[PDB]
């Protein structure tokens, strides 16, 4: 696992994405911290969201554990920052680097699944009162992420 994780630390250093940043905490290559910039032209715009990443000892044969530390309003992310997303579970592939995972998570923010949600109340608001959803997501971004 560690050779692959070091590669990715190197993949990030040679080709860092504007949208996100990540690296180890306290030189422990299995435990990382990350940031995702909220997408422009969305309720999350201008927000900087922090995440934790724990790589399993069998990475990349199993997915990284990724969770938000920053509170964020979204049907697929709960009050503990847990992210319910297929590529972090059954649909994982070792082809996905942590950079691609973070970009994937960023892309989830504006592409929620409100039909099989992690947070049913938020899903209901998303589908039935979208202007209210947008208002609340923008207000949470301003309060928590800025």
């Amino acid at each position: 696992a560690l050779k692959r994780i070091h590669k990715e630390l190197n993949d990030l250093a040679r080709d860092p994405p504007a949208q996100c940043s990540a690296g180890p905490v306290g030189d422990d290559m299995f435990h990382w911290q990350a940031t995702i910039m909220g997408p422009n032209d969305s309720p999350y715009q201008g927000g900087v969201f922090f995440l934790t990443i724990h790589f399993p000892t069998d990475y990349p044969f199993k997915p990284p554990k990724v969770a938000f530390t920053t509170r964020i309003y979204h049907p697929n992310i709960n009050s503990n920052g847990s992210i319910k997303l297929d590529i972090l579970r059954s649909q994982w592939s070792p082809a996905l680097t942590i950079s691609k995972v973070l970009l994937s998570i960023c892309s989830l923010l504006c592409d929620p699944n409100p039909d099989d949600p992690l947070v049913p109340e938020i899903a209901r608001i998303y589908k039935t009162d979208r202007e209210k959803y947008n208002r609340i997501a923008r207000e949470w971004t301003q309060k928590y992420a800025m």
């Binding site: 691609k100 892309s107 929620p112 992690l118």
Partner: protein, 77 residues
């Protein structure tokens, strides 16, 4: 007529010849020709958002020299 870049699932970057009017569907077909990944499994990301089939590079303000990120098809839940 311009060229953009795609960071593929191999982490390598490839160059595509496109038109601002090309659809995302068209772009995914060009990616398939090089990478052998069906469009159904491709998710393209630019400016932190997925690019939807049916729209055009221009719709997304994708200009020459822009880099698109290819990840795998995903769904929240």
């Amino acid at each position: 007529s311009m060229q953009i870049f795609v960071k593929t699932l191999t982490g390598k970057t490839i160059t595509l010849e496109v038109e601002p009017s090309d659809t995302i569907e068209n772009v995914k077909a060009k990616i398939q020709d090089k990478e052998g990944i069906p469009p159904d499994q491709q998710r393209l990301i630019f400016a932190g958002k997925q690019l939807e089939d049916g729209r055009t590079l221009s719709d997304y303000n994708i200009q020459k020299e822009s880099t698109l990120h290819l990840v795998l098809r995903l769904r929240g839940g």
